[PDB]
């Protein structure tokens, strides 16, 4: 499923807040947030 408007879903129904993306922290289990595509680094 999908998470709410204030949550960004990484993978496998685990979502983090919008400010928690590209903030030097792999909060998610799949670490999809800091990937070169979403972060660009």
């Amino acid at each position: 499923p999908t998470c709410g408007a204030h949550e960004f879903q990484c993978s496998t129904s685990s979502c983090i807040p919008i400010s928690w993306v590209c903030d030097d922290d792999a909060d998610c289990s799949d670490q999809s947030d800091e990937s070169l595509e979403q972060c660009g680094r």
Partner: protein, 53 residues
């Protein structure tokens, strides 16, 4: 974003406040330990100072 956690911290500055026992005679220092918090479960503490990191 890393910048989202520092939007309200750019408006703040360090300060010099007194603290006892720099060396021997209770200085006025840029580092001033205020409100040490030690209520965790593995000896991890949080220290608030006057400097900005």
């Amino acid at each position: 974003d890393l910048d989202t956690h520092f939007t309200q911290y750019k408006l703040a500055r360090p300060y010099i406040a007194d603290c006892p026992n720099c060396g021997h005679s209770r200085c006025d220092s840029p580092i001033a330990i205020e409100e040490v918090r030690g209520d965790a479960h593995a000896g991890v503490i949080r220290i608030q100072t006057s400097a900005m990191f």
